[PDB]
């Protein structure tokens, strides 16, 4: 169907796959970093999910040059695919808009 | 049944080497840590290393004198620790245990009575 | 390295009594602390998870409790199986770490 919720789902997905990769990578690169807390599989998902919506409360966080690299990846991602909701919700509201004028 | 086997016993050589296993078996993931921990007689636990099998990465204790090197096979699902150039400072029971990545050991190995004598 | 003190290093206790085994983390851990029994020639069992979870096949009897840097292991009722030795371990920051263990002892 039509281009703009397509690419939503498969942002949607996208993420989902990011959040969990992130996850099983930010603990492997962490653990072997002395006074690194982000080394747990659990608590990595919900730190990734915070910094993917860039909330980012700060109880977590990489230390290591790999861990923050992940990091960025999932910030980017997080960005980039609720970006591209916004811009999917444009498409339809213009879409919309355009009928209701008659155009 | 025993999720991780290890032998009773090895003898080793001073300055000689030795390589322990210990073949895990049960539920198996890629999240799964295989740890090492040396306890001395009448002594404590003393944590060595870990590694996870599904990558192959290892880690080490750094406020101790590193004489093991951890390495796993996937495909016998046994974890090794070799010990190299070893002393009578390095004769104990060495413990294998199963983390599932969330920070505790769930079940542990009988362990390996590794005695250091010519 | 988070240091995991636990005193007193032996504990002496009269039969059905209630014990508690004292964890004390260098810095503050949450609940990220878990406790093993180890009895003679045995290898260590886990008895409590994330500071107060219970495990399945572990006797009710067995309790923990605390957050932060102190923690509470504890026995209500002890009996003759419960000699042991119980350390503490924690998982907050790398490198794991254990406590140096207490010692229960009985007497009858």
């Known amino acids: 169907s039509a281009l703009h919720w397509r690419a939503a789902g498969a942002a949607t997905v996208l993420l989902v796959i990011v959040l969990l990769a992130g996850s099983y990578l930010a603990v492997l690169a962490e653990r072997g970093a002395p006074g690194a807390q982000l080394i747990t599989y659990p608590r990595a998902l919900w730190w990734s999910v915070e910094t993917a919506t860039t909330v980012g409360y700060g109880d977590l966080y990489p230390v290591t040059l790999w861990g923050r690299c992940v990091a960025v990846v999932v910030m980017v991602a997080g960005i980039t695919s609720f970006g591209l909701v916004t811009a999917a919700l444009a498409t339809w509201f213009v879409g919309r808009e355009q009928e209701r004028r008659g155009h | 049944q025993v999720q991780l086997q290890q032998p009773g016993a090895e003898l080793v050589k001073p300055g000689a080497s030795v390589k322990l296993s210990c073949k895990a078996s049960?539920?198996?993931?890629?999240?799964?840590?295989i740890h090492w921990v040396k306890q001395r007689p009448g002594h404590g636990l003393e944590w060595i290393g870990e590694?996870?099998?599904?990558?192959?990465?290892?880690n080490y204790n750094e406020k101790i004198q590193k004489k093991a090197t951890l390495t796993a096979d996937k495909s016998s699902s046994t974890a090794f620790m070799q010990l190299s150039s070893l002393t009578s400072e390095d004769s104990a029971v060495y413990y294998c245990?199963?983390?599932?990545?969330?920070?505790?050991?769930?079940?542990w190995g009988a362990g390996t009575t590794v005695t250091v004598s010519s | 390295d988070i240091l995991l003190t636990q005193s007193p290093a032996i504990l002496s206790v009269s039969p059905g009594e209630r014990v508690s085994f004292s964890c004390r983390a260098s810095?503050?851990?949450?609940?990220?602390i878990h406790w093993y029994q180890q009895r003679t020639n045995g290898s260590p069992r886990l008895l409590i998870k994330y500071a107060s979870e219970s495990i399945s096949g572990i006797p009710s009897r067995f309790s923990g409790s605390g957050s932060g840097t102190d923690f509470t292991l504890s026995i209500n009722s002890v009996e003759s199986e419960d000699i042991a030795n119980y350390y503490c371990q924690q998982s907050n920051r790398w490198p794991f770490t254990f406590g140096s263990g207490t010692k229960l002892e009985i007497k009858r």
């Open positions: 049960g539920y198996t993931f890629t999240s799964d840590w």
């Open positions: 590694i996870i099998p599904s990558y192959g990465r290892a």
């Open positions: 245990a199963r983390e599932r990545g969330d920070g505790y050991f769930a079940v």
């Open positions: 810095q503050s851990i949450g609940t990220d």
